[PDB]
Amino acid sequence: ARDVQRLLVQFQDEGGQLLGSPFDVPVDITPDRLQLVCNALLAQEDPLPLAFFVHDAEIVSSLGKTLESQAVETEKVLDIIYQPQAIFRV
Amino acid sequence: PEEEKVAAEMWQSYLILTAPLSQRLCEELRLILEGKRQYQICLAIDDSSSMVDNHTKQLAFESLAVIGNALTLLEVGQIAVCSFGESVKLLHPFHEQFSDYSGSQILRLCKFQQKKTKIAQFLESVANMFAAAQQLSTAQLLLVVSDGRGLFLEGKERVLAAVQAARNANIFVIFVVLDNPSSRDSILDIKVPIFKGPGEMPEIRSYMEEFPFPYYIILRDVNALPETLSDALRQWFELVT
Ligand SMILES: [Mg+2]
């Protein structure tokens, strides 16, 4: 319906373990929506809060915003690294 | 430049493997076709680097050898070959005859190193090429040989309109989806999320549910190409009559 960029994405651990199969995703996807897709793939009773990184740069507002600061090879499947958010002291 | 010998030798090795398949395809198409007009067929090769990532390079060359020679054996008409990716290249014109030397030339010029897969740009350009040849003389057929992945970088709305514009121009399009069984993920396993509502769980559909081409075949093994593609061409022939 829109002419925003879409591309293939693959979720994986910090340790490199892939999660699910690749996903076609609009480039303006938010970390909040990435969390919802990740909750589906993990299928846990209570989903952990997650942070998302592409090439060691965190996705804060949108995937497209983070990619604007990188020289990415668009033909390849983009790997997205997820990690649980920190728990702070006391 | 003289090292066209390398390309010619490579094409000859493809002809050795694909010769029986091309005859089976010719015969099966002949049986279907009897059941004065002239045919114009364009073969489009995806020259983007994802073909190397998805290991669909061999399937692409094998398919071109099978299809291009079967159409030549069948004496259907004029064959054009195009490559697309970052730009559109006409590798073989309609009015020139398609021979083994033509196949060697396509082999040398397709290195699958292009950094984009602009399928919408390709479709918008071929309409001018088809329309110019319709008036030079007919049923027109476009066969897209591609991995069918990463097709939405230009925007989904633009890609869908480009497919619709080819149909409105009376061009019949069949997408030949190359799917190597050795690859980690099949194109049937790629998924797409659909969101609705704040914080609500998204619906997980298959990526092929939004494939912008309604007429397609899935090719895992070139040995299945004669039986699968000839069955698919039934729809084109019936629409022409
Ligand atoms: Mg590609």
Curated annotation (Swiss-Prot), chain A:
Family: Belongs to the NLE1/RSA4 family.
Species: Homo sapiens (Human)
Gene label: NLE1
Subcellular location field: Nucleus, Nucleolus
Stated name of the protein: Notchless protein homolog 1
Residues that bear Phosphoserine: S69
Role: Plays a role in regulating Notch activity. Plays a role in regulating the expression of CDKN1A and several members of the Wnt pathway, probably via its effects on Notch activity. Required during embryogenesis for inner mass cell survival.
Record region (Ubiquitin-like (UBL) domain): 4-86
Subunit structure: Associates with the pre-60S ribosomal particle. Interacts (via WD repeats) with uL18. Interacts (via UBL domain) with MDN1 (via VWFA/MIDAS domain).
